[PDB]
Design a binder for this molecule. Structure first.
Ligand code: NA
Ligand code: NA
Length: 107
């Protein structure tokens, strides 16, 4: 369960879920992203919490390789990285989160 495996896992999950958030339970920016998504699709999307993953470091290293940054949250829609918590809240506020969810078939 090293970094190469984590990259594999994340890429497969991102390609196979309309909306997926990599998160940790104690994380106010993760909550900002979740609350933004919950304005449109509460209860319908995947969250992967990382704080009790034995391979949490490899998973966050994999997120860096895939998205450019290591921090949670890391939000993906329709297989494409959206951003973190501020990004997801901004997209909720400006009308684009709804449109991206529609285009993904999640809404
Ligand atoms: Na969904
Ligand atoms: Na966990």
């Amino acid at each position: 369960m090293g970094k190469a495996e984590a990259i594999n896992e994340i890429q497969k999950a991102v390609a196979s879920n309309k909306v997926i958030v990599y998160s940790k339970t104690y994380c106010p920016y993760c909550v900002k992203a979740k609350n933004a998504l919950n304005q449109f699709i509460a209860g319908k999307y995947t969250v992967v919490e990382l704080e009790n993953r034995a391979d949490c470091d490899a998973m966050q290293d994999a997120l860096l390789d895939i998205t450019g940054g290591r921090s949670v949250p890391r939000v993906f829609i329709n297989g494409k990285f959206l951003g973190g918590g501020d990004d997801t809240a901004a997209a909720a506020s400006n009308g684009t989160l709804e449109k991206l969810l529609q285009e993904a078939g999640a809404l």
